[PDB]
Amino acid sequence: SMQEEDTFRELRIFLRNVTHRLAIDKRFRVFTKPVDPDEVPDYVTVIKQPMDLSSVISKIDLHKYLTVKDYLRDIDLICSNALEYNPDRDPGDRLIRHRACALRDTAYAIIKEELDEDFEQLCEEIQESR
Numbered sequence: 001s002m003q004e005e006d007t008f009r010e011l012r013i014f015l016r017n018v019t020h021r022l023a024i025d026k027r028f029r030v031f032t033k034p035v036d037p038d039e040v041p042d043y044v045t046v047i048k049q050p051m052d053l054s055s056v057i058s059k060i061d062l063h064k065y066l067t068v069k070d071y072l073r074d075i076d077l078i079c080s081n082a083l084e085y086n087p088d089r090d091p092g093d094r095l096i097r098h099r100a101c102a103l104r105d106t107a108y109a110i111i112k113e114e115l116d117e118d119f120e121q122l123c124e125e126i127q128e129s130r
């Protein structure tokens, strides 16, 4: 319905705003764009589903997220990709893992404080009805 489309539009506005705040945080610069295969040629064979904050914006605009739960699956994917690709004790790996966990924790904290739980419940019930 039209009222439901208004709900999903508000969801998209909210998600663009959260995503922008993550993307401008200097800690998360490494997550802002797709990984370049020239810099790390082994990435596409290890990481089966690359994800990054620019791709998240593209998916918002393609209406791929109908709930914040589905949005957070892609944030979690950015983080789990980083943990999987950087598992070693080396400081370069440990820095990226720390940033990845900070990205996840920051996204979840913004949503816990700013997402109304009845709004999310409404999105989930619309999604379930289709």
Ligand SMILES: C[C@@H](CNC(=O)c1ccc2c(c1)NC(=O)CCS2)N1CCOCC1
Residues within 6 Å of the ligand: 029, 030, 031, 032, 033, 034, 035, 036, 037, 039, 040
């Ligand atoms: C400028 C682009 C492209 N850079 C890379 O994809 C990249 C991936 C892994 C490493 C490095 C660069 N750096 C190294 O020193 C080699 C070992 S780790 N970035 C992509 C992610 O977000 C935006 C910026």
Ligand SMILES: C[C@@H](CNC(=O)c1ccc2c(c1)NC(=O)CCS2)N1CCOCC1
Residues within 6 Å of the ligand: 030, 031, 035, 081, 082, 085, 086, 092, 095, 096
């Ligand atoms: C080895 C680098 C630290 N690592 C990165 O800068 C980096 C950049 C982009 C990505 C990644 C790492 N890897 C990921 O998995 C996230 C998505 S791409 N150092 C930087 C300072 O000087 C020395 C070397």
